[PDB]
């Protein structure tokens, strides 16, 4: 059954070079092509090129011409994708495709998971941790929201988890924002019973594990 | 040739059982070199149509493609549970082959008002040369919501960013937060802290506030 297992997340910086693999599965490599596809955050999907297994033709984006070479290894049914001198806006998701060969319309009819790559002149940080406390303007008829500010770290992901995995219901952590520093921040916020702020212990789980940083704050009413 | 394509509605919601069409126009001619994808959150795209009409391996029968000129149309028949992600169309005439800027179809439910809540910057970070207030709203529907800011009744523009949750799978809402980043310097010349929701299921915006040191 047909897969395209790509690698791992990147974090690179500014004019540095990145190469993703893709390893194909269940079919037979060197009878199709393989294209490139890449989604920056919240945004939509830009083809890069395309590079037929059997002869090494490639087809590049203009806008990527001389920065992007696309190669495949047909011993080991596996294509690569090395983006040069790389830039801020080349942050993106990056997936490999399958083509069939010899359609009168070429079409992308499998898709390998993504590999997130990062470009960036950020130092590793982790991440301070803030009370969202609830307070009377985090009220509302019987119930109030809290919450933890996941400020200023770098790179993506932080893991936030609430007393331990055993707090689900009404939690909603938000998607990580990029500052204008470089840096990310998130928010982590949990609705609760009002009458059980005095009476029960809120926790916020980080994660940060680039930076090996791990941090349990308590949110308390003010 | 760089074609642009364009894809109308930009989003829509819909409920099972619904027939649900979705538009893209390319901006030239194409003859039918166009294929349908659909993407759900975190995942890969997936081929539904290619060459306009033609129905991929697997793909259930009620999505169906037709083309008119430079008109194309995605068709779900009957939606259903998983179709509920966002459909892009895709050019393969002229390299650079384009992708549409997708149709995301959200669930249909009823109006739902924002619940919002208004969090002072902590003791904590004030502390450390920064003010952080963050404005949350919770589980409201549609989409569509306005969260302005102001300061000592000072629209603020610029210094504040907002993200937002995919919709819920237990309620079908959304929830949005705010964040509008103040130096602690700046923070403190000023009293009143003000975020201001505009939202349909709200007959008059909503505002929640509070004045610094109380």
């Known amino acids: 059954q047909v897969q395209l297992v790509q690698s791992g997340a990147e974090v690179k910086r500014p004019g540095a070079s990145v190469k993703v693999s893709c390893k194909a599965s269940?079919?037979?490599?060197?009878?199709?092509?393989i294209s490139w596809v890449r989604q920056a955050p919240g945004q939509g999907l830009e083809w890069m090129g395309w590079?037929?297994?059997?002869?090494?033709?490639?087809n590049y984006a203009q806008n990527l011409q001389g920065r992007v070479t696309m190669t495949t290894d047909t011993s080991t049914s596996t294509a690569y994708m090395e983006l040069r001198s790389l830039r801020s806006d080349d942050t993106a998701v990056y997936y490999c495709?399958?083509?069939?060969?010899?359609?009168?319309?070429?079409?992308?009819?499998?898709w390998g998971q993504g590999t997130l790559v990062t470009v960036s002149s950020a130092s590793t940080k982790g991440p301070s941790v803030f009370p969202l406390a609830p307070s009377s303007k985090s009220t509302s008829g019987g119930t109030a929201a809290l919450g933890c500010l996941v400020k200023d770290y770098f790179p993506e992901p932080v893991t936030v988890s609430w007393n331990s995995g055993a707090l689900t219901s009404g939690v909603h952590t938000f998607p990580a924002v990029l500052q204008s520093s470089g840096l990310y921040s998130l928010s982590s916020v949990v609705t609760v019973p009002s009458s059980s702020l005095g009476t029960q212990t809120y926790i916020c789980n980080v994660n940060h594990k680039p930076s090996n940083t791990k941090v349990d704050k308590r949110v308390e009413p003010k | 040739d760089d074609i642009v394509m364009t894809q109308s509605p930009s989003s829509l919601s819909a409920s099972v059982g619904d027939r649900v069409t979705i538009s893209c126009r390319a901006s030239?001619?194409?003859?039918?070199?166009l294929n349908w994808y659909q993407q759900k959150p975190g995942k890969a795209p997936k081929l539904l149509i290619y060459?306009?009409?033609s129905l991929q391996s697997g793909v259930p029968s009620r999505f169906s493609g037709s083309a008119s000129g430079t008109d194309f149309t995605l068709t779900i028949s009957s939606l259903q549970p998983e179709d509920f992600a966002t459909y892009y169309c895709?050019?393969?005439?002229?390299?650079?082959?384009?992708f549409g800027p997708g149709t995301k179809v959200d669930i249909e439910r009823t109006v739902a008002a924002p619940s919002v809540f208004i969090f002072p910057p902590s003791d904590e970070q004030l502390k450390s040369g920064t003010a952080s207030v963050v404005c949350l709203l919770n589980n409201f529907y549609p989409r569509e919501a306005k969260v302005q800011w102001k300061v000592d009744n000072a629209l603020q523009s610029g210094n504040s960013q907002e993200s937002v949750t995919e919709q819920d799978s237990k309620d079908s809402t959304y929830s949005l937060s705010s964040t509008l980043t103040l130096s602690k310097a700046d923070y403190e010349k000023h009293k009143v802290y003000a975020c201001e929701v505009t939202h349909q299921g709200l007959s008059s915006p909503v505002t929640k506030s509070f004045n610094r040191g109380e």
């Open positions: 495709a399958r083509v069939i060969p010899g359609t009168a319309v070429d079409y992308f009819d499998y």
């Open positions: 269940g079919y037979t490599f060197i009878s199709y092509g």
């Open positions: 590079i037929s297994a059997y002869n090494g033709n490639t």
């Open positions: 030239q001619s194409i003859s039918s070199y």
């Open positions: 060459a306009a009409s």
């Open positions: 895709q050019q393969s005439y002229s390299a650079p082959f384009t």
